[PDB]
Amino acid sequence: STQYETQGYTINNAGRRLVVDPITRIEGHMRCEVNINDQNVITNAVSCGTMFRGLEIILQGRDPRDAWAFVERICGVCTGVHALASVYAIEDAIGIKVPDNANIIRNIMLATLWCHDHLVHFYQLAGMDWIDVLDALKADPRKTSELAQSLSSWPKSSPGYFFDVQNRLKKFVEGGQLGIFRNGYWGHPQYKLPPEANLMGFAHYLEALDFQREIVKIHAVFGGKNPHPNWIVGGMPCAINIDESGAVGAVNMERLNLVQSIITRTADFINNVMIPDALAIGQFNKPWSEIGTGLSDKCVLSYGAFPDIANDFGEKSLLMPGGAVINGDFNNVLPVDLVDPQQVQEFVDHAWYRYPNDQVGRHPFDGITDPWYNPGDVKGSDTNIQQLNEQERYSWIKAPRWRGNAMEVGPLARTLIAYHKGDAATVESVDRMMSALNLPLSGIQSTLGRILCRAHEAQWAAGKLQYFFDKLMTNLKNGNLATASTEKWEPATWPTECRGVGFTEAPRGALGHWAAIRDGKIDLYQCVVPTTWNASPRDPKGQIGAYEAALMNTKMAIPEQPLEILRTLHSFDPCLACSTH
Amino acid sequence: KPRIPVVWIHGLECTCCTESFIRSAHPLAKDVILSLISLDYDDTLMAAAGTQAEEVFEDIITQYNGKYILAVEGNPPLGEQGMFCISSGRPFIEKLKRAAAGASAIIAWGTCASWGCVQAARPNPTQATPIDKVITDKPIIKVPGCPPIPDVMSAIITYMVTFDRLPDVDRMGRPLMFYGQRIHDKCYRRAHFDAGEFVQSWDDDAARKGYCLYKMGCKGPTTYNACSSTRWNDGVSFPIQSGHGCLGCAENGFWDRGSFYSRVV
Ligand code: SF4
Ligand code: FCO
Ligand code: F3S
Ligand SMILES: [Cl-]
Ligand SMILES: [Cl-]
Ligand SMILES: [Cl-]
Ligand SMILES: [Mg+2]
Ligand code: NI
Structure with missing residues (x-):
């Protein structure tokens, strides 16, 4: 066994080794290993991406106008975000400016995704780490109604309703066919909700499973379908026609009315179901405000998103702030430049890729994706990994660093950046939320904080949907209908050689696509994705990524039942297809 | 009274097919899961992880050997001895073959499982391979699309449950209905x-x-x-x-x- 110091942690692989493979209730394929000491405390954590497809390789030689459709398939959970980053990157390379309505609609597509993705994550992915579904069977329906009514104005709260939900669960379980609840962690001492809160949460899990399907109707109107809507380089393909012949063949007043109806319903659900549930999880699980801090009190990163001024990606335009904090110095939010070769770099000394020199990091314009499955000595065989060797290569995920620093990205990172840049709405929201929980600000830098920030973001995004929709309608009232710029659609109009960066904030954090075009075709296409940051393996200095740091120092009540590991990992909302692409 | 057991496995994928499934409007995916089938294994949605998830997988395929439907999302890569997609430390293809062996029929969801989809596009770095090129002794219903239409997925499910038969298919194994x-x-x-x-x-x-x-x-x-x-x-x-x-x-x-x-x- 070995031991070394990094980022204030003591990384020690002595003691019992635990393996969690597969990690479930995430997107895609992940393996986690930890070592625990004699006090059942984690002293080593190993994050492993267990899938790879090679989109960066597949994109070579494609027409840049087609790229968005390929890279959209990086992920069907964060569906659309890679298409947005792609059209941004190609437009940046060629020098294309899109019409205002195209930008507004793109912002609507992104805000719609944030609402949908965050809602499903809260209930379907992370929810069962916090809600003991089986314990809901011991709830009093009247007490459940009383609890729900004390927390929210949401209409659906009758004792009869909660009795009906409980009875359905009872009948579901009675024959032994527990389905998704089979062999769960039910009864674990870390489940702290009373039975009435478990029944309320489970009812809401079902309501959210039903309701989420409606949110994406906004993607269907502007983008044809969800998952995987359509886009174009130059704007959007959803031509608008309000008051002319043939409006039946375009985005017309009836289509816009449908969009408005979905926006209102989405805000209602988020504000009156998700938000009170998140706060309730906080109230019953306060110790989790001090678990899973990881890098969130050290290094956080946002690129920023939602340019409100069309084709302007600067600080005055982006509605979601960008910036970086390192070394716990939140008084100095640093500017991020995605072209600067000394800023974003990826390392592969601990990943299954080949570089000419694996001791150096490569900026994505210098990126290389040469897969090399080389696990070394793994206590089994190349096709039977019993124990990853974290001293060498152990993941399909590359290791991104920012100025050589390991960073956390995502809702908590964004919230901290916005808070410390002095965004008034963020400061007010965060302070009020922490006051309601009777917790200090530092309580947000934790596994519980990640969950609270995500719910806050869904509420923010639902509000922004209305703002963007109103902006669109304002343009239409002024007779501004344009949705595409085609001046530079034809390859004959492009520079022979050019390169571009497209960036945004996906639901899970900072996303960048780096594209180089030559002779009308993609010469290089490199992606660094939010879960690539968070689930990163180690670098040449032995610095650990966000997941590994967040798992460090964690007490486990029952080593064989990894509930604490799942709680912290799920709080980051891992997307493994994203991370590896 | 008992519901038909379903095992839903995931190879190389983007998860668009699971996402499409939960969009179903009629029946709601909620009602499919609670009332129509027993969704007994599914990485994206299940409570159990790690060894507990392995235990569920093994228990279901043993207890219901010959009687469960296998749903497959994504596909196996043949490159690097299959280790482009790793499950419980071993090639995904091993879990695919184990799950297929006990299945009564297989549903190949999406263009991934049916054909290959994006990871199989030139130059196919991982040797991603559709299910019917690996499993050659089982009924496979291809339901292609990236992803398929949500209400098509659920209509195919309800057809099989209601009529207790596989849909009639074209020469490529796609349901004629859709x-x-x-x-x-x-x-x-x-x-x-x-x-x-x-x-x-x-x-x-x-x-x-x-x-x-x-x-x-x-x-x-x-x-x-x-x-x-x-x-x-x-x-x-x-x-x-x-x-x-x-x-x-x-x-x-x-x-x-x-x-x-x-x-x-
Ligand atoms: S009629 Fe035109 S738009 Fe419709 S499927 Fe045929 S080619 Fe496409
Ligand atoms: N959100 C999201 Fe997917 C990841 N990680 C992207 O980009
Ligand atoms: S792109 Fe696919 S979703 Fe339908 S319209 Fe064409 S088959
Ligand atoms: Cl250029
Ligand atoms: Cl294909
Ligand atoms: Cl035919
Ligand atoms: Mg990459
Ligand atoms: Ni994703």
Whole structure:
């Protein structure tokens, strides 16, 4: 066994080794290993991406106008975000400016995704780490109604309703066919909700499973379908026609009315179901405000998103702030430049890729994706990994660093950046939320904080949907209908050689696509994705990524039942297809 | 009284097929899961992880050997001895073969499981391979699309449950009900196609009147799916209705059939 110091942690692989493979209730394929000491405390954590497809390789030689459709398939959970980053990157390379309505609609597509993705994550992915579904069977329906009514104005709260939900669960379980609840962690001492809160949460899990399907109707109107809507380089393909012949063949007043109806319903659900549930999880699980801090009190990163001024990606335009904090110095939010070769770099000394020199990091314009499955000595065989060797290569995920620093990205990172840049709405929201929980600000830098920030973001995004929709309608009232710029659609109009960066904030954090075009075709296409940051393996200095740091120092009540590991990992909302692409 | 056991496994994928499934409007995915099937294993949604998830997998395929339906999302890579997709430390293909052996029938969800989809597009770095090239001794129903239509997924499920039989299929294993006709055979813009009324560049006057997208590269004429009739997301739209030509996403190798903006040959 070995031991070394990094980022204030003591990384020690002595003691019992635990393996969690597969990690479930995430997107895609992940393996986690930890070592625990004699006090059942984690002293080593190993994050492993267990899938790879090679989109960066597949994109070579494609027409840049087609790229968005390929890279959209990086992920069907964060569906659309890679298409947005792609059209941004190609437009940046060629020098294309899109019409205002195209930008507004793109912002609507992104805000719609944030609402949908965050809602499903809260209930379907992370929810069962916090809600003991089986314990809901011991709830009093009247007490459940009383609890729900004390927390929210949401209409659906009758004792009869909660009795009906409980009875359905009872009948579901009675024959032994527990389905998704089979062999769960039910009864674990870390489940702290009373039975009435478990029944309320489970009812809401079902309501959210039903309701989420409606949110994406906004993607269907502007983008044809969800998952995987359509886009174009130059704007959007959803031509608008309000008051002319043939409006039946375009985005017309009836289509816009449908969009408005979905926006209102989405805000209602988020504000009156998700938000009170998140706060309730906080109230019953306060110790989790001090678990899973990881890098969130050290290094956080946002690129920023939602340019409100069309084709302007600067600080005055982006509605979601960008910036970086390192070394716990939140008084100095640093500017991020995605072209600067000394800023974003990826390392592969601990990943299954080949570089000419694996001791150096490569900026994505210098990126290389040469897969090399080389696990070394793994206590089994190349096709039977019993124990990853974290001293060498152990993941399909590359290791991104920012100025050589390991960073956390995502809702908590964004919230901290916005808070410390002095965004008034963020400061007010965060302070009020922490006051309601009777917790200090530092309580947000934790596994519980990640969950609270995500719910806050869904509420923010639902509000922004209305703002963007109103902006669109304002343009239409002024007779501004344009949705595409085609001046530079034809390859004959492009520079022979050019390169571009497209960036945004996906639901899970900072996303960048780096594209180089030559002779009308993609010469290089490199992606660094939010879960690539968070689930990163180690670098040449032995610095650990966000997941590994967040798992460090964690007490486990029952080593064989990894509930604490799942709680912290799920709080980051891992997307493994994203991370590896 | 008991519900039919279903094991849903995941290879190399983007998870768009699971996401499409939960969009179902009728029946709601909630009702499919609670009342129509017993969804006994599914990485994306299940409570159990790690060894507990392995225990569920092993228990279900043993207890219900010969009697469960296997749903497959994504596909196995043959490269690097299968270790481009690792599950419980071992190649995904081993779990696929184990799960297939005890299945009564297999549903290959999406273009990934049916054909290969994006990871199989040139130069196919991982040797991603569709299910029917690996499993050769089981009924496989291909339900292609990237992803398939949500209400098509659920209609296929309800058909099998209600009628206690597999859907009749074409020569490629696709259900005739939804894949028997082309997008272009039921497209509401066909009047324009037949009149030579085409969008020529984005947001031109033709686009604003809903003219045909053939000259913009629409692959509807060579693509079999239900998008132009059943439509998407509770009948709200489909690619062509919102102004983009069909990409061909339900067809084998659609990624490599030339630019999406080049006209059908
Ligand atoms: S839009 Fe496409 S599917 Fe419809 S008529 Fe034109 S070519 Fe055919
Ligand atoms: N959100 C999201 Fe997917 C990841 N990680 C992207 O980008
Ligand atoms: S791209 Fe796919 S979703 Fe339908 S309209 Fe074409 S088959
Ligand atoms: Cl350039
Ligand atoms: Cl046939
Ligand atoms: Cl294919
Ligand atoms: Mg990459
Ligand atoms: Ni994703």
